[PDB]
Write a protein that binds this ligand. Structure first.
Ligand SMILES: [Ca+2]
Ligand code: NA
Length: 205
């Protein structure tokens, strides 16, 4: 007499080359119980569990127990992995995937191929370049002798000030500064952010 499938809440799952990610989806059922969770590509029919890319992993604690999937304490599925440096992106790449859960009566969440289900049982995994994860602080001011001709010492000073203001940028990202004070941050995936000189340097001319 339970003919209602488990309901899923996911999110906007943005991930970044060279970075780990972790998201948690939430699942409830009217019976209070969920016995199985699969995350999958749309194709392949009812028995398919195929999911790509292969670096997308998931796990669900406490399956198959009474009351493991209620509104007050939803079942949670960890969706996680490590994005390779060699993923192809433009600004981004999209992968649309589905979370299917089963209750004890065998009712399974239905896959509906429509963007108006995104954030429920359907989610978009958006892969972005590494630069997009970081918003470099354009706080810091380095006084130089002449804004049109920074010395090596002045360029190193600017780079050190940018690093000190940005502890969360990847340690192995490379901060370089040109002879006019323009800052380039080159991330491990070789994408870049740039900071115009007038946000980091001044002179007294
Ligand atoms: Ca149900
Ligand atoms: Na950025």
């Amino acid at each position: 007499n339970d003919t209602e499938a488990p309901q899923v809440k996911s999110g906007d799952y943005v991930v970044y080359r060279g970075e780990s990610f972790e998201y948690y989806a939430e699942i409830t059922d009217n019976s209070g119980q969920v016995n199985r969770v699969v995350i999958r590509n749309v194709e392949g029919g009812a028995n398919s569990t195929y999911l790509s890319p292969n670096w997308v992993k998931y796990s669900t604690e406490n399956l198959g127990r009474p009351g493991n999937a209620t509104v007050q304490n939803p079942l949670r599925t960890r969706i996680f992995g490590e994005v390779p440096l060699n993923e192809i992106v433009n600004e981004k790449s999209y992968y649309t995937r589905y979370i299917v859960a089963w209750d004890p009566s065998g009712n399974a969440t239905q896959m509906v191929d429509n963007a108006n289900r995104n954030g429920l049982e359907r989610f978009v995994l958006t892969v972005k370049s590494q630069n997009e994860k970081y918003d470099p602080a354009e706080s810091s001011v380095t006084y130089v002798n002449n804004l049109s001709n920074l010395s090596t010492s002045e360029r190193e000073a600017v780079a050190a000030a940018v690093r000190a203001a940005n502890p969360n940028i990847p340690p192995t990202a490379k901060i370089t500064v040109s002879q006019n004070g323009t800052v380039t941050i080159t991330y491990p995936d070789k994408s870049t952010d740039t900071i115009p000189a007038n946000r980091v340097v001044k002179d007294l001319q």
